[PDB]
Design a protein around this ligand. Structure first.
Ligand SMILES: CC(C)(COP(=O)(O)OP(=O)(O)OC[C@H]1O[C@@H](n2cnc3c(N)ncnc32)[C@H](O)[C@@H]1OP(=O)(O)O)[C@@H](O)C(=O)NCCC(=O)NCCS[C@@H](O)C[C@@](C)(O)CC(=O)O
Ligand SMILES: C[C@](O)(CC(=O)O)CC(O)O
Lengths: 377, 377
């Protein structure tokens, strides 16, 4: 159906760009008019969104072209201040289309709720007392949020970890594992963590302290793949084969050197965070999950991978935590976050997460390609 | 002197808040008009900032109250979508004022430019060749930006790192260490890395690949301290002494468990990134430097520290990379970034960096204090 190629888009006026988007999507007049004039976020909404509001602050709102996800073309809205990002994403997506576009998958939308318990004399024994009573705790967690349960989410499981060696004594930390459906999940799981805390306290005999989600959302992973052939990467100076080898050298550099990995992953987030902003979502949560995950091994490394396959084609992956929502907060109340969701066509939060990692992978590829092909001056 | 306490700000309308800010600072009618009306970022500017622009996207623009930095009251603009951030930062700043406010310092604005060298069988020897000729390399770097040197910046040093055994062969990586004065520094140091590459090839006999800044800006540190007394933290349910103990428990939990540290550090960036956005700065760069620094030890831990001093008072620190500019990127392009810098009063980029880490420290304190008393919900 949709054709995201957007021929000539980069050279069109903003008004003509918006008209072409509107035709492809069948946008209503009200939708297009959200960009007829500045001020689409009414001040009454802005004033209800955060505290001490005195006005609004604009960033450019753009659409990356050419993206295709599991064979379906998609248009990607992005909000950011920095040049080259949107063009690089668009151009790498153009190259990806020739080899099948981006292929994506994701896990269920599972989030951790931590419950921290201090002052237990026998924490290792208390862990087993909690695990034996897992079903009772899960049932309690699922008591209140009737809507979530009806929609196919809810607390699925508990894990319990112990930290024997802290300067503040031993700590037991229970994790509720919660399917949050189309929410990012923080209010859902924080509510459950506060709800089960008295019962955990009764089972363990400790004092509950923190009841709080984890932003290291490593059970809520999204995955993207891309493939590029050497003919597509040939430049005036370098064969495509040589460019592929240069990109592999750049990847190996990021995998060994944290000073490079930080910059390399920053480029991924140049692609991802503007889509988070465009959909009214929390970009600090996505950033923290991204970079903490990059150093889960004890070494801060690259979130993407880059290889050559047995045909000599460049293949990239991005697998990372990606907690986002279609509901909640500004995603619902900002008229342009709703328009962004309309432009994307996503029907679940995990579908939005899959587009996010495709854009992050495309952005990293574009950044590496530029650096690997620039002549010595 | 300016008074940042902003009486009843929480309950004034956006218009009345803006009028009061304008009166405190002596803003002109035309400056106040930039926030009183939508559209301060005109489309010809937005269309020139990034590619494929179709419009602009607003976030609320707020001011946190009560902040005081090295004895001087400071108004802090913040652009973000999530509720309770601005309120919690203002609340914690209120408490800090009673004990001297926030005390800050920072290093010189030093940034790394990486120059990756491949193609030689003797990287360990080539590193010494580069160090032997380091003055010649530094002089060439500095010939490329005479204005920066006159402004008191420039390349100060080089350091060279080797990776003799990678899966892609031997590499060595030179770092130019560059004082970038009031810029974030990326374009400034990339230019120097390009300029020295041919000399580094001549010295080493190798091939230069990547020439690029590092976002792990660990020579560009900003520092903040805060102190809170137990009487300030007493609640109806908890003695202030008990709250202090509970905050130390929360800190120890972040220091041992990355699932908590990621969330703890996310709470810091809730305060920092909105100031970065409000000043037209690159928040992906600040995020990447923050989270990579947090795992420099081989364990992803807390950016802040929390302790109790000899008087029983709670004392907090935040020391972290903080690469921001007053010039460069979009700092000058966005009329409201310029207005933010006027509201802040900052005259150097390191002064902005110091305010950023004070806000981050305040934000973390606010999150932990709520989690250690009634809970975040
Ligand atoms: C502040 C609260 C939201 C409510 O305050 P309250 O009711 O207790 O006391 P109050 O006597 O009424 O007000 C005390 C002072 O607060 C300011 N103030 C109060 N309300 C105001 C308002 N509406 N407008 C303006 N200024 C207001 C104002 O300065 C006021 O002073 P005032 O006397 O008026 O001159 C508090 O619950 C509090 O901090 N909660 C913590 C919230 C928090 O951290 N959010 C972070 C985001 S979540 C997540 O992304 C991060 C994380 C948690 O996961 C991170 C992690 O896990 O680590
Ligand atoms: C090219 C960039 O530095 C990413 C990278 O180096 O891979 C990102 C840009 O914002 O500077």
């Amino acid at each position: 159906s949709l054709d995201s190629r957007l021929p000539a888009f980069r050279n069109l006026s903003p008004a003509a760009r918006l008209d072409h988007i509107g035709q492809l999507l069948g946008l209503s007049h009200d939708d297009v008019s959200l960009l007829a004039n500045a001020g689409a976020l009414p001040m009454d909404i802005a004033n209800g969104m955060i505290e001490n509001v005195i006005g609004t602050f604009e960033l450019p709102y753009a659409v990356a072209s050419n993206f295709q996800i599991n064979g379906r073309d998609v248009l990607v809205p992005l909000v950011v201040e920095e040049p080259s990002i949107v063009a690089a994403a668009s151009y790498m997506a153009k190259l990806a289309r020739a080899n099948g576009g981006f292929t994506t998958s994701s896990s269920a939308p599972l989030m951790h709720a931590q419950v921290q318990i201090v002052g237990i004399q026998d924490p290792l024994n208390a862990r087993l007392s909690l695990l034996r009573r897992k079903d009772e705790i899960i049932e309690l967690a699922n008591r209140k949020d009737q809507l979530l349960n009806s929609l196919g989410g809810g607390c699925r499981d508990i894990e319990v970890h112990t930290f024997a060696d802290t300067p503040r004594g031993p700590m037991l930390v229970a994790h509720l594992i919660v399917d949050v459906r189309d929410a990012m999940g923080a209010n859902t799981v924080n509510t459950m963590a506060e709800a089960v805390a008295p019962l955990m306290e009764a089972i363990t005999g400790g004092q509950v302290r923190l009841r709080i989600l984890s932003n290291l959302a490593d059970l809520r992973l999204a995955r993207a793949q891309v493939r590029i052939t050497p003919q597509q990467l040939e430049t005036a100076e370098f064969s495509g084969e040589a460019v592929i080898e240069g990109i592999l050298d750049a990847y190996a550099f990021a995998a060994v050197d944290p000073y490079r990995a930080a910059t390399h992953n920053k480029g991924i987030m140049n692609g991802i965070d503007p889509l988070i902003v465009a959909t009214g979502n929390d970009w600090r949560a996505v950033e923290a999950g991204a970079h903490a995950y990059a150093c889960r091994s004890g070494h801060y490394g690259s979130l993407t991978t880059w290889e050559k396959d047995n045909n000599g084609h460049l293949v990239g992956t991005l697998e990372m935590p990606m907690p986002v929502g279609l509901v909640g907060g500004a995603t619902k109340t900002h008229p342009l976050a709703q328009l962004s969701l309309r432009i994307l066509g996503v029907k679940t939060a995990q579908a939005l997460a899959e587009i996010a990692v495709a854009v992050g992978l495309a952005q990293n590829l574009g950044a590496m390609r530029a650096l690997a092909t620039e002549g010595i001056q």
